[PDB]
Subunit: 141 residues, 2 copies
Amino acid sequence: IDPFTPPTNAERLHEFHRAIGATPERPTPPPPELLRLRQTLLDEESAEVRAEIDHLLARQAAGEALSAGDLAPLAHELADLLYVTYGALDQLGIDADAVFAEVHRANLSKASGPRRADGKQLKPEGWRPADVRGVIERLQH
Amino acid sequence: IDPFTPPTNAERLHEFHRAIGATPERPTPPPPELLRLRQTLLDEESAEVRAEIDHLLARQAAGEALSAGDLAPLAHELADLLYVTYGALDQLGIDADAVFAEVHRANLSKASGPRRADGKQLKPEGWRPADVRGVIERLQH
Ligand SMILES: [Cl-]
Ligand SMILES: [Cl-]
Ligand SMILES: [Cl-]
Ligand SMILES: [Cl-]
Ligand SMILES: [Cl-]
Ligand SMILES: [Cl-]
Ligand SMILES: [Cl-]
Ligand SMILES: [Cl-]
């Protein structure tokens, strides 16, 4: 499935990494041990988000109408996930906003296509996929 | 483990959801079926990120010095993950930037603590944890 089925937050992660001694201004591969760690951490944070969804689903199944406050733990974990995802991009010395803008361009464009009779989102004429490599090359040079 | 071990992107997701017919201005619980979907999608996108890390790790292990371009698929998947994470928060009608700011405050503050002899990050005096519930209540009211 897929989605169709003042400083920015990226800049905040740069501030954070400065604080913990952790980053490059241009795209730069990290040490293996650091990739490994990032992989684990993404793994863990996505697991916590999915667990909080499970709790809400169980409460809804029992018939509860959740309040705004009830959504806080999930919102907290989601933000934690943004943090470590932005963290990865910052660690890589990749401008997250530049890459995000290109991904957003392509997704928004795809959203403007027609739908199949069964409701599946189709691409519009002349749809242009996200060219993230082009963004990276641009940032590097 | 943990991290110690112009429109914003959140606003872009609101634009996207408008485009696909998908959102609330105040925190609002979603339908169960939609939570279920979001859970699956987070699951899948985090799996793809972790797979791209595996590929880079294998290349590094073989002795390669990765170029900036080599990082594009990982950067692309990371941005895809931001997209569906921001997507969740938007779906919930929760201002992602407000929640992120509070999580960032707490993380940056924790970073200012001393480290144990073994290098573990300790909290500073009077450290105040992220109060995401307070943010949610504020957004609701
Ligand atoms: Cl509900
Ligand atoms: Cl409440
Ligand atoms: Cl991080
Ligand atoms: Cl198509
Ligand atoms: Cl490398
Ligand atoms: Cl290259
Ligand atoms: Cl989404
Ligand atoms: Cl501590």
